[PDB]
Write a protein that binds this ligand. Structure first.
Ligand SMILES: O=C(O)[C@@](O)(COP(=O)(O)O)[C@H](O)[C@H](O)COP(=O)(O)O
Ligand SMILES: O=C(O)[C@@](O)(COP(=O)(O)O)[C@H](O)[C@H](O)COP(=O)(O)O
Ligand SMILES: [Mg+2]
Ligand SMILES: [Mg+2]
Lengths: 469, 126, 469, 126
């Protein structure tokens, strides 16, 4: 009649329950890789165990209610800790989370556990979530993207080259009718798409429904003129889900092909709802990642963009901005190639040289089209085609509306540059070595391209990278 | 400033903004199809069925989003499954255009792993 | 017939348009204070101008469409740049945004401009939004909090002391009926509230509607037993807005007083919708700040919690976690006192010693109750009452469910400790100097308190602070 | 482990978990009211109206959230606007309890700038 393990009140180390280095991960576990910087005097095992505990089942002192359930079944487990080379106080802590911890189909819930409270613990100095292994059994609980790359190309009837888009400029301050005027002139010159700026929602200078109607006129005029399917990402981003849905409904009722949403500033709950609406009504959904660099820029703290991209894939989006590598916003090449594969492909093997900490199996969830946008122009075209291949949308806002001859010629310049690079690649030319030659030849041929070539010839964006592997 | 004409300037998707493809340039695209193991296929349409249009939406409620008529064209024979010879593709271009000399004709290629058309361009305009 | 200013294609410095050091800010302008770390070779004026431009009206090359509107009227303006003492490459850049740039009532829109893209620019190494001046004319476009502090106390009939709450533990893994059992035992001992953990939504081990019903039984049993109004924050956080609303509706239909939402992981669009629902149906709305430390922990990059708190005040919440200062999660005293005032008060003067960069006038928008939670126990009670005063909710999860005698005695211990400290303060005792004595006297009197006193006597959380002013 | 009794253990909000307030302790709370310039007021209820209850919800649709009967008690006279003398408050406690010796009686104080009750505790139980 000896006593079994009972309730003992008081504080004990988290590592006694949550550091389990001999744990064999299950194929349904959600895995996290945390770059962890402990405070002085806090062992890495204890820090990793605290992160595991406080993102799963545990708090700061022993609770009696553990005994009513099975902590073995539910606890998050720090199962491995690696030193970070180059770093004397950074570790990669690996945490396994049983699939029962998560609400089916809810990115919101998954983030709330894994990143909800642990980043603020006094016992750590910095914490960065680098990667998540989303198992097939959890992937299958999500609707995911409304359409995905193959369906999108099939609906648009567009094959054999990158898609081309363009953000209308000035960001803010244009009227609805000037917005449509700019859109028509852009689309008619050869761009597949234009878009509302991420912060163009509904404002005193331009109310949303006015914009949607004039943009519809522009889409249909440019489509009739060119014979190519056109779209403009009309922004459904709003202050409330009711306003977001009213905007999506208006796009549906105008018969236009594509809307956009700012998934992080609007939020995952609203994004997932909008993605389901877009699936149910046949709208393409472009996702803008506004605010991501608040979270993902610094190497020591936050969440890497690859996790934000996985989360968007799950919540749902047909497009997601991927960065450009060569443009005005940061994105290192290898980092970017890694998360582009995580966005598009069905099965991505572990590859630490591209920041892929876990093998990821998407179990047939549609791929998300990467959108390369921001400070790019015609001379970047070879590099963009080389980096992304055909399954991407390349967007030129300033690179279209900054052309000296206006939007149609600006659009034509970009379309010619893209087609010339695509043709050259298909003919066997190496765009990484011959890209300048391809553009120079095309500039000599096309007057519209030549004007763009001259204006932006010396413009490059080359800075020290913060988000290094 | 040159003005981009809105008049009689309809386009046909990939490669429409370049000079018309020469026979050498078409053959190079066929070589790319065969090098990547994609499935060549020819499609064609009379002029009245070659351009995207909206007439079937008269029968719809509010469900026209990404519905257009005339995206589908007519298949020439069957996709050339197993074709690893560019000369066979070029011969079929000749046969198709001989049979339908007034039609729009496009060469496409399919990838069966992505299950999507992975290239396409016009090879004949009436 | 001389030529006026026209369109000149090409790149020019952002500072030519967006650095305006002689600008007199308007009383309707939204002001931002950015802690900015430029790349080497980028003048602070140019970096500040880039931040202003790319968060308002500008892109990387000159666009012709500026001429159709008035950039003077709409442009964001970097109007002042201050050096940061102790820092050779940090500056505070102040940016003014015309009120016309923003969608009325939309925190989503405001963040999308101010923090949407500028944090990822290659030309800066780090960027942190420290503060926002929200002018009364923009404040008045928001519904704001459903009820706010005065109305909440009036609905609950609770006056003259801090409110007391408690998160149920284990975080995850309890069944619905065990959740209700724990809740009843907590509430009946003297806690005003219990709550779902932030990550308790709906899961295989416990489906939400089952929990809501058993929690209702527990609330009503504890209320009948004690004669004091009771509540339990039932989590409406969900994967989709439809699921979020279904959960809010069930709480409405059970007649229970309070629900909770994870505003950052659910997102501002869903939060604002839920706040409006709570206003329309008389539910109190507790806001959990899960994920905030992903954004707000580091001094050099992200968004300070005071801005996240202002944003929540605008979007709407009756409660918001404020940190504890003394518990397991970080929150420096002066920093915290500053944003507590920004959460509760009508008018808060500039005070850089508490991180308040701008005078903030809330123009009668209800105050949000600060919730101090996380790693606190009875010995912290004097410090908590001293820091927060009566208008706060102090939450003891582990500090209740870790009591050696169970939840009712644990609740009683916390309620006695709070009442003893409140009485002592009202009698003229200085809690900052006499707090230990007050608790020691109360421990000698109350058996339930004495048990808690003994178990947690040596437990403190004292670490180097990352988020320093 | 001591068990917290569920039987006959009803509470009355602030200070109910401490020993019953002595006369000195009540006077100290009155001093705190006067020191902060708050408005003293007495409220009272017969036993049948002293405890929170739900009976009016029989008349409702689904709108009972944060509706309870018996939160309001009956005002003794008027709030003591302008009162800066603790002895006047203590005299009114005596007068109120003399008039209603079988009633629950509570002392509250109001802040007119927040426009909320800022303190309150029971001074008489039947
Ligand atoms: O607001 C802007 O700056 C853009 O419209 C691009 O304008 P330009 O085409 O004129 O540069 C895009 O939203 C950014 O590309 C977003 O960044 P990211 O794609 O990195 O999320
Ligand atoms: O999950 C937790 O840890 C808690 O339930 C507290 O548990 P204990 O009461 O058992 O510590 C709270 O959610 C945290 O306080 C949130 O942090 P913050 O308030 O800083 O946002
Ligand atoms: Mg943009
Ligand atoms: Mg919690």
């Amino acid at each position: 009649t000896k006593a079994g393990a009972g309730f003992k009140a008081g504080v004990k180390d988290y590592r006694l329950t949550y550091y389990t280095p001999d744990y064999v991960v299950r194929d349904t576990d959600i895995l996290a890789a945390f770059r962890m910087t402990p405070q002085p005097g806090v062992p890495p095992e204890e820090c990793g165990a605290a992160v595991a505990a406080e993102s799963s089942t545990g708090t700061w002192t022993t609770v009696w209610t553990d005994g009513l359930t099975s902590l073995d079944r539910y606890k998050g487990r720090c199962y491995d800790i690696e030193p970070v080379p180059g770093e004397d106080n950074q570790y990669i802590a690996y945490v396994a989370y049983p699939i029962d911890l998560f609400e089916e189909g809810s990115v919101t819930n998954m983030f709330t556990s894994i990143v909800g409270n642990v980043f603020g613990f006094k016992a750590l100095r910095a914490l960065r979530l680098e990667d998540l292994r989303i198992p097939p059994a959890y992937v299958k609980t999500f609707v995911g993207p409304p359409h995905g790359i193959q369906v999108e190309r099939d609906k648009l009837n567009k094959y054999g080259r990158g898609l081309l888009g363009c953000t209308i400029k000035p960001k803010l301050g244009l009227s609805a009718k000037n917005y449509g005027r700019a859109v028509y002139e852009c689309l008619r010159g050869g761009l597949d798409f234009t878009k509302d700026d991420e912060n163009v929602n509904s404002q005193p200078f331009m109310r949303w429904r006015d914009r949607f109607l004039f943009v519809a006129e522009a889409i249909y005029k440019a489509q009739a003129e060119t014979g190519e399917v056109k779209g403009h990402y009309l922004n459904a981003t709003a202050g409330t889900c009711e306003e977001m849905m009213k905007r999506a409904v208006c796009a549906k009722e105008l018969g236009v092909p594509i809307i956009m949403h700012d998934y992080l500033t609007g939020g995952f709950t609203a994004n997932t709802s909008l993605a389901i609406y877009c699936r149910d009504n046949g709208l393409l959904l472009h996702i803008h990642r506004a605010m991501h660099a608040v979270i993902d820029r610094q190497r020591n703290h936050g969440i890497h963009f690859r996790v934000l991209a996985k989360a968007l894939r799950m919540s749902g989006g047909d497009h997601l901005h991927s960065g450009t590598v060569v443009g005005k916003l940061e994105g290192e090449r290898e980092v970017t190639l890694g998360f582009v594969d995580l966005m598009r492909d069905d099965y991505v093997e572990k590859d630490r040289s591209r920041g892929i900490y876990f093998t990821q199996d998407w179990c047939s969830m549609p791929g998300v089209m990467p959108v390369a946008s921001g400070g790019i122009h015609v001379w970047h075209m070879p590099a963009l085609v080389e980096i992304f291949g055909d399954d991407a949308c390349l967007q030129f806002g300033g690179g279209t509306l900054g052309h000296p001859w206006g939007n149609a010629p600006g659009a034509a310049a970009n379309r010619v540059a893209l087609e010339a690079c695509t043709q050259a690649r298909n003919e066997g030319r190496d765009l990484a070595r011959e890209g300048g030659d391809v553009i120079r030849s095309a500039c000599k041929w096309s007057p519209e391209l030549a004007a763009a070539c001259e204006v932006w010839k010396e413009i490059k964006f080359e800075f020290d990278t913060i988000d290094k592997l | 400033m040159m003005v981009w004409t809105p008049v009689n300037n309809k386009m046909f998707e990939t490669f429409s903004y370049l000079p018309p493809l020469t026979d050498e340039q078409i053959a190079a695209q066929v070589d790319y199809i065969v090098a990547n193991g994609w499935i060549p296929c020819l499609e064609f349409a009379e002029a009245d069925k070659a351009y995207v249009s909206n007439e079937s939406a008269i029968r719809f409620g509010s469900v026209s989003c990404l519905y257009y008529d005339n995206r589908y064209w007519t298949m020439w024979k069957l996709p050339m499954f197993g074709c690893r010879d560019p000369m066979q593709v070029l011969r079929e271009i000749v046969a198709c255009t001989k049979a339908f000399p007034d039609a729009y004709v496009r060469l496409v290629a399919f990838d069966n792993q992505k299950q999507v058309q992975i290239m396409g361009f016009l090879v004949q305009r009436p």
